[PDB]
Design a protein around this nucleic acid. Structure first.
Ligand SMILES: Nc1ncnc2c1ncn2[C@@H]1O[C@H](COP(=O)(O)OP(=O)(O)OP(O)(O)=S)[C@@H](O)[C@H]1O
Ligand SMILES: Nc1ncnc2c1ncn2[C@@H]1O[C@H](COP(=O)(O)OP(=O)(O)OP(O)(O)=S)[C@@H](O)[C@H]1O
Ligand SMILES: Nc1ncnc2c1ncn2[C@@H]1O[C@H](COP(=O)(O)OP(=O)(O)OP(O)(O)=S)[C@@H](O)[C@H]1O
Ligand SMILES: [Mg+2]
Ligand SMILES: [Mg+2]
Ligand SMILES: [Mg+2]
Lengths: 330, 256, 318, 497
DNA sequence: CCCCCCCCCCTTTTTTCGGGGGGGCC
DNA sequence: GGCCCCCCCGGC
DNA sequence: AGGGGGGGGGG
């Protein structure tokens, strides 16, 4: 890095350095701590969605096992590096079959993002794993399990990283506020959690954007309005009004309301559709085909939007689909 | 260790091995109380190599019981290349030999190099080579024989040796003209080495491939005078006389 | 804190053919061949983690005694197994002269042979044929269709079956007694249920439990080992009502961290292997799942697409 | 040295002479006759073909399914005739460079081993003559460069008998061997041609083998005597009785799996039995997907070609054949879209299983039944090649006339070509040989050549075909036109094309 | 020589990046 | 020993 | 499925 850590992005500035700074994975953290505290550390397969803390967890585990000079005693290979059949055959085999250099210890290999590896390399790694197990251990981090061969999966103990719970995100937010001397309104916190979807990177990015948006962070408190302005996401009140107008009001006034709501803050149609879907998922419908039509038509509209096209036609289609689906209620 | 054969210098053994290394891939050695014998058959089943070394070439030779050793040229050549050419070379073989031991001994720097060469299982039994009544016998120096073979191989892929009364002709008619070399018996008192000698019995006209002759003449530096024995219908016998023993090539002639 | 303990998979790896569970007929046949000698060329096929490599290693060790080091040539996917290697090193090993007991032969163990190229397999044919009096070949593969027909013709066939619940359970009791592990019946049943016949996974789960919680029970096993997601996908696809399927997808799949691509792939496989459903209905569901998969691969990996796919499947099956 | 009870049953009970070879008697007799009259053909320069037709081929190409005894028969016939066997196999590098320094010498040279082994023998005129055996020709891979061509040249400039052994003959790599060797085909031996041998083996090995269950074993091994011998050796290790009580288990456990050919795949996939309620439980959807994957580069084409020539038996009540055909065509179009997406820059090969259903399984499930005629190989490849050639010629013509015309190749084909025909072909049919000057003037104005003329006149279709019209043109007119074209200089539009 | 079961075997090439293998120059 | 070039799979 | 081809039985 350059200068100091204050110039780093919040996503990288607040990267955990030890295992006790990882939140939302109490079971996995306790299990790995117990494993590394009594010498029985098996091969690990950390499977989870982005932003859960798998890389941070493995880095902290390596630091605890080896210490400050852990970078020179582990072999970290990721998608950014070339990992082919020849690499597995030569470099990984040599690392697993050779003693340590700086200090006595066992060999650790971290194959981050191994789901992007070829099948030949995965097949080759089987005997490398099963032959040098006495002095070497393997850790594989993945987001999609279908990319891993069954043979590789059989040789690794599986640990699943769940989406971050609400309390963990609140604790991390409180720590960040304490470090940055910032104040957050409770409604702003709830909106941040709602839009976070269990990813801490989104929390940090949105919080940094909100801090940058404030006129003076020293004596300004971030509110839900600030978060909505920074992210441009529709407000819940706007979504409720749009849904109400679509459901009860006629075509002309519903179209006018949708246009006015979208043009007031430059809202995007996809976010409105997502919010309407979330709101309607809790509706106690009396018929099934109505829900079927809603889901199918909204998925079609989302797919069409993903490829671009006329936005006004897409909004009219959304309104018409909702009206037609709710017509079946009778 | 019933077999122990010591060469004062490994150069002799290396020169023996590499003289027929480029024509065969598998060799069988029989070690007896009277010395070493060896037979090799090429992949194409055309060129046969026979070899024997008497007890005179060994400063020390002990062989309680006869033994057999199957060897490959590549591994033996590599092992020999590892050692130098100015050290005593000891070949050691025990009962029921699955491998042989090569000892490179340097008595000035006190250096010992031990190599183990794994033996190969070869089914092929030795062909009974019987003394043939060769019609034509010729003895010529190795140097000019190698020269003529190398020069004529560039003009044709198969050359015809014709032996007639006081005439030995090497016809090399092919793609490049029809250049040929004709020689006659000649005796030099001052230089007995260059003495072409002819034992004419019956006319001979035999065609032989260029590649086999090129491979055979590779041993010209090994010896000084080469003896070519030809018959009406039989493989040419190219005898390379040794200090104790000799090296023989049998080359089957081409049809018609 | 740097002295690793040997995992139970390697610590308790069988060293004799009598310690291998499952596939009784094949194990007794291998034991009889080892006792009587004259081991023929063989190809052993089966799913991962059932004891093929262990079986071949034990057979070779028992057959060759102290000559294992000089009489066994082991090559796997982690070593160079090109056409040149087969043409030179394997030929040299086969032609090697090694004195062995009268009833024994040299052994070449080509593990994970399914990854070998066609040229090497073609070149191996006459190598096995000519030198069958001194050297014998034992291949271990996961997919038997990757081996050329001539090699299968020259070799016996040993198709390992799936380990039964009783055999895995018995091995678990033996290992627990050896390690003096406190266990309960429900915990062992859960471990076997999650293993799905994979002994290696069962051993890994049994070690992770006790290594992390001490005592084995259903809750301890389930809090670290998750139920196989294919079963949850099958349950979701077989839901009587759309609401139940949506709830299952939201609670057990989406909120547990499973990716949409994995979910759609698992749904594809489950629909591929659903016997209770009619073939035509299965084909329609496969078409819908393929449409959803194509949509996801383009970038729209949203829960909305999965919900729409479930709704369309329910409409088709109505 | 080698104990008699420590050898594989295949080597222990290998045939000792040709009389012990089971099955394919006619092929054995043909090969023996060919090898027993090679000298006479050589004296005749392989010109006077005999009644059997084996007097003109100096090489033999033996082919058949694996494990039938081609190599054994070849070796035994070579031994019985007194020839010296020189075997080249797949475990030896057989590239063009290595072959040029190898067997060429032995093809026209006598053997030294034969001379030094049969010297004391009499009447053994064949002991000194080489016979070349090239086993596992199909086994040559990228490691052997230019071996097929070298062998093809060998089969025609060979001075010694040559016998080639292979497992697959329909493969394109065997095309050079089409008409340069005597083709000898070995069939799968019948269950009655090996009954006596198998009973003898069972008696010798002291295990009971019930004759009534013998056929199934061959049905399990599918003509592989080596495989059934290995099966017997393995089963007899612990089970000393082979009866109907355990035949089913061993048959199921030792079933051989061989990928079906595209024609067989099309025949099986277009069968209505497997798509029935009872058949589906035997041949499942996974089985159909595996059948497709046996050859995924040909199965969709065969299905698309042969789905219009069936008599469906799975038609829904009230559904007609045409409706099922339309549904199959729609599914085929969807599968084509999926295939296009698969081979894009993203290389989405994970969609291959889906392409199995949308291209082969589903369309066949709607028209499954009995074929109304012979199965025809897909004709789309030839049509695609012809269209590519036509597009290349059209591009050449368009860029030759680009300086004069204001249009694209599509516009040139759709609009300009009829008008051009009105000036370059019509006046030859009215004024005879007096229209040469005008045609040459048009060519000069549009930088056209005679080859361009041929290409243009070959594009027309429908009732405006020009082949018959061109052929009916008098030869004198065409000769005069060619002479006039070749007797003057013409401008060139593109330089160094 | 001529005819009738019983079965076997053959009817056949185009393809978008990225990775791997194996041959040829040097 | 190193580029450079050509052919061939790619799902479970 | 349609057509060609080899081998055992009848003639
Ligand atoms: N459990 C966590 N506790 C605190 N911060 C976290 C946690 N998880 C993620 N983060 C934060 O998000 C940042 C990125 O975390 P990562 O370790 O990169 O997640 P990841 O699971 O490795 O992403 P993938 O699966 O490779 S895309 C960290 O530097 C932390 O600042
Ligand atoms: N039949 C078995 N009996 C006892 N333990 C077994 C058995 N099979 C597998 N295991 C255990 O699981 C471990 C691994 O077995 P493996 O031999 O590696 O399975 P595998 O079928 O060879 O795996 P693949 O196909 O090469 S991925 C063994 O060391 C044993 O501890
Ligand atoms: N007609 C036969 N009769 C008796 N045994 C046979 C016969 N054919 C093959 N075998 C047996 O199978 C063994 C090997 O036969 P092969 O000649 O190698 O088969 P193949 O026809 O050459 O098939 P490929 O192309 O080499 S896989 C022989 O030693 C015999 O024991
Ligand atoms: Mg990461
Ligand atoms: Mg294994
Ligand atoms: Mg064979």
């Amino acid at each position: 890095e350059k200068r100091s850590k204050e110039n780093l992005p919040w996503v990288e500035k607040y990267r955990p350095e030890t295992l006790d700074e990882v939140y939302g994975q109490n079971e996995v953290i306790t299990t790995v701590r117990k494993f590394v505290d009594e010498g029985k550390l098996p091969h690990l397969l950390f499977y989870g969605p982005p932003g859960t803390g798998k890389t941070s967890t493995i880095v902290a585990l390596a630091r605890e096992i080896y210490g400050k000079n852990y970078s020179n005693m582990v072999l970290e290979l990721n998608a950014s590096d070339d990992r082919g059949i020849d690499v597995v055959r030569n470099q990984i085999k040599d690392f697993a079959s050779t003693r340590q250099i700086f200090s006595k210890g066992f060999k650790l290999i971290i194959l981050d993002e191994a789901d992007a590896m070829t099948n030949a390399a995965q097949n080759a790694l089987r005997r490398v794993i099963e032959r040098y197990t006495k002095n070497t251990r393997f850790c594989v981090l993945a987001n999609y399990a279908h990319k891993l061969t069954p043979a590789l999966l059989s040789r690794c103990t599986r640990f699943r990283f769940q989406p971050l719970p609400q309390e963990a995100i609140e604790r991390r937010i409180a720590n960040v506020l304490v470090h940055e001397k910032l104040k957050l309104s409770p409604n702003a916190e709830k909106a941040l959690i709602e839009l976070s979807n269990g990813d801490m990177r989104r929390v940090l990015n949105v919080l940094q954007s909100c801090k940058a948006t404030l006129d003076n962070p020293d004596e300004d408190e971030i509110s839900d309005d600030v978060i909505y302005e920074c992210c441009g996401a529709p407000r819940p009140s706007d979504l409720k009004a749009v849904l109400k107008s679509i459901l009860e009001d006629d075509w002309g006034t519903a179209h006018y309301t949708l246009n006015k709501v979208r043009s007031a803050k430059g809202l995007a149609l996809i976010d409105l559709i997502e919010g309407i879907v979330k709101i309607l998922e809790d509706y106690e419908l009396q018929n099934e085909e109505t829900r079927v039509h809603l889901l199918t038509k909204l998925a079609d509209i989302e797919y069409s939007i993903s490829k671009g096209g006329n936005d006004q036609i897409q909004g009219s289609a959304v309104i018409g689909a909702i009206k037609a689906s709710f017509e079946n209620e009778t | 260790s019933m077999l122990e054969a010591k060469f004062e210098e490994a150069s002799l053994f290396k020169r023996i091995i590499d003289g027929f290394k480029d024509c065969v891939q598998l060799v069988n050695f029989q070690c007896k109380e009277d010395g070493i014998i060896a037979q090799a058959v090429d992949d194409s089943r055309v060129l046969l190599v026979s070899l024997e070394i008497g007890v005179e070439a060994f400063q020390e030779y002990r062989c309680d019981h006869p033994v057999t050793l199957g060897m490959d040229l590549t591994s033996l050549s590599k092992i020999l290349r590892c050692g130098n050419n100015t050290d005593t070379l000891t070949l050691i073989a025990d009962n029921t030999p699955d491998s042989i031991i090569l000892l490179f001994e340097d008595t000035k720097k006190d250096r010992i190099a031990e190599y183990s060469l794994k033996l190969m299982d070869i089914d092929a039994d030795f062909l009974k080579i019987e003394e043939l009544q060769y019609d034509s016998t010729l003895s010529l120096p190795s140097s000019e024989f190698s020269k003529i073979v190398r020069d004529l191989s560039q003009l044709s892929d198969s050359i015809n040796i014709m032996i007639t009364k006081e005439t030995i002709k090497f016809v090399a008619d092919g793609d490049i003209g029809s250049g040929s070399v004709i020689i006659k018996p000649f005796v030099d008192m001052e230089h007995p080495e260059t003495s072409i000698k002819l034992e004419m019995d019956q006319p001979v006209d035999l065609t032989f491939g260029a590649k086999y002759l090129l491979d055979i003449i590779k041993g010209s530096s090994l010896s000084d005078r080469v003896g070519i024995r030809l018959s009406s219908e039989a493989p040419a016998l190219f005898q390379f006389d040794l200090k104790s023993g000799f090296l023989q090539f049998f080359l089957a002639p081409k049809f018609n | 804190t740097l002295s690793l303990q040997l995992p139970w998979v390697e610590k308790y790896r069988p060293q004799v053919l009598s310690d291998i569970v499952g596939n009784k007929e094949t194990i007794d046949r291998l034991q009889q061949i080892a006792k009587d000698g004259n081991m023929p060329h063989m190809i052993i096929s089966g799913m991962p983690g059932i004891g093929k490599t262990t079986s071949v290693h034990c057979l070779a060790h028992e057959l060759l005694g102290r000559s294992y080091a000089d009489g066994v040539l082991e090559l796997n996917a982690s070593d160079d197994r090109g056409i040149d290697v087969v043409r030179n090193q394997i030929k040299h090993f086969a032609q090697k002269k090694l004195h062995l007991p009268p009833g024994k032969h040299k052994i070449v163990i080509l593990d994970e042979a399914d990854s070998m190229t066609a040229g090497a397999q073609q070149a191996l044919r006459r190598t096995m044929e000519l030198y069958s009096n001194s050297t014998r070949f034992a291949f271990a593969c996961n997919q038997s269709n990757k081996i050329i027909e001539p090699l299968q013709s020259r070799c016996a066939i040993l198709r390992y079956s799936k380990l039964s619940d009783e055999d895995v359970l018995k091995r678990l009791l033996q290992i627990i007694k050896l390690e003096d592990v406190k266990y309960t019946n429900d915990g062992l049943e859960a471990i076997i249920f999650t293993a799905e016949g994979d002994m290696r996974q069962a051993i890994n789960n049994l070690q992770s439990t006790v290594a992390g919680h001490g005592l084995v029970n259903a809750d301890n096993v389930f809090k670290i080992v998750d139920s196989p997601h294919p079963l949850i996908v099958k349950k979701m696809l077989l839901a009587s009502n759309l609401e139940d399927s949506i709830q299952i997808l939201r609670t057990d799949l989406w909120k547990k961290g499973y990716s949409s691509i994995d979910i759609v792939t698992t749904s594809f496989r489950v629909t591929k292997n659903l016997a209770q459903v009619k073939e035509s209905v299965r084909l329609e569901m496969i078409k819908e799942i393929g449409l959803t998969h194509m949509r996801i691969l383009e970038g729209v990996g949203t829960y909305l697409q999965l919900a729409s796919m479930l709704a369309k499947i329910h409409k088709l099956n109505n | 040295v080698v104990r008699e009870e420590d050898k594989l049953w295949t080597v222990k009970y290998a045939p000792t002479n040709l009389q012990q070879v089971c099955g394919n008697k006619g092929s054995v007799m043909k090969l023996k006759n060919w090898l027993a009259n090679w000298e006479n053909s050589k004296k005749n320069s392989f010109k006077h073909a005999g009644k059997d037709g084996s007097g003109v081929f100096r090489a033999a190409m033996l082919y058949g399914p694996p494990g039938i005894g081609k190599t054994t028969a070849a070796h035994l016939v070579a031994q019985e005739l007194g020839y010296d066997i020189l075997e080249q196999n797949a475990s030896d590098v057989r590239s063009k460079t290595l072959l040029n320094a190898g067997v060429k010498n032995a093809l026209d040279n006598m053997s030294v081993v034969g001379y030094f082994k049969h010297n004391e023998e009499a009447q053994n005129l064949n002991g000194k003559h080489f016979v070349i055996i090239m086993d596992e020709v199909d086994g040559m891979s990228g490691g052997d460069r230019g071996g097929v061509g070298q062998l093809a040249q060998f089969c025609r400039k060979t001075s010694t008998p040559l016998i080639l052994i292979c497992n697959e003959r329909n493969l394109p790599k065997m095309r050079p061997f089409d008409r340069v060797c005597l083709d000898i085909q070995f069939r799968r031996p019948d269950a009655n041609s090996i009954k006596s041998r198998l009973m003898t083996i069972a008696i010798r090995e002291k295990f009971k083998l019930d004759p009534n269950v013998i056929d199934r074993l061959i049905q399990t091994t599918r003509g592989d005597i080596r495989q059934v011998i290995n099966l017997l050796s393995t089963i007899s290790t612990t089970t000393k009785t082979i009866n109907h009580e355990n035949i089913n288990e061993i048959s199921k456990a030792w079933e051989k799996n061989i990928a079906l050919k595209p024609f067989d795949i099309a025949h099986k996939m277009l069968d209505g039995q497997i798509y029935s309620d009872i058949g589906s439980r035997n041949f499942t959807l996974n089985d159909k997907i595996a059948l497709y994957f046996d050859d995924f580069d040909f199965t969709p084409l065969m299905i698309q070609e042969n789905y219009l020539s069936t008599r469906p038996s799975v038609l829904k009540p009230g559904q007609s054949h045409l409706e099922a055909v339309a549904e199959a065509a729609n599914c085929i179009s969807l599968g084509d879209i999926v295939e296009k997406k698969i081979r894009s820059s993203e290389q989405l090969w994970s969609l291959l299983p889906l392409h199995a259903v949308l291209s082969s399984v589903y369309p066949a499930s709607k028209v499954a039944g009995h074929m109304a005629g012979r199965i025809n190989f897909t004709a789309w490849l030839g049509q695609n090649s012809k269209s590519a050639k036509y597009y290349r010629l059209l591009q050449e013509i368009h860029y030759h006339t680009r300086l004069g015309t204001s249009t694209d190749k599509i516009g040139l084909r759709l609009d300009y070509l009829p008008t051009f025909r009105k000036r370059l072909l019509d006046p030859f049919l009215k004024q005879g040989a007096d229209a040469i000057s005008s045609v040459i003037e048009v060519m000069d104005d549009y930088y056209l050549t005679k080859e361009d003329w041929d290409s243009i006149m070959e594009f027309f279709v429908g009732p405006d075909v020009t082949t018959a019209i061109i052929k009916k043109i008098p030869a004198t007119v065409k000769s005069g036109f060619t002479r006039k074209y070749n007797s003057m200089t013409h401008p060139v539009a593109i330089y160094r094309t």
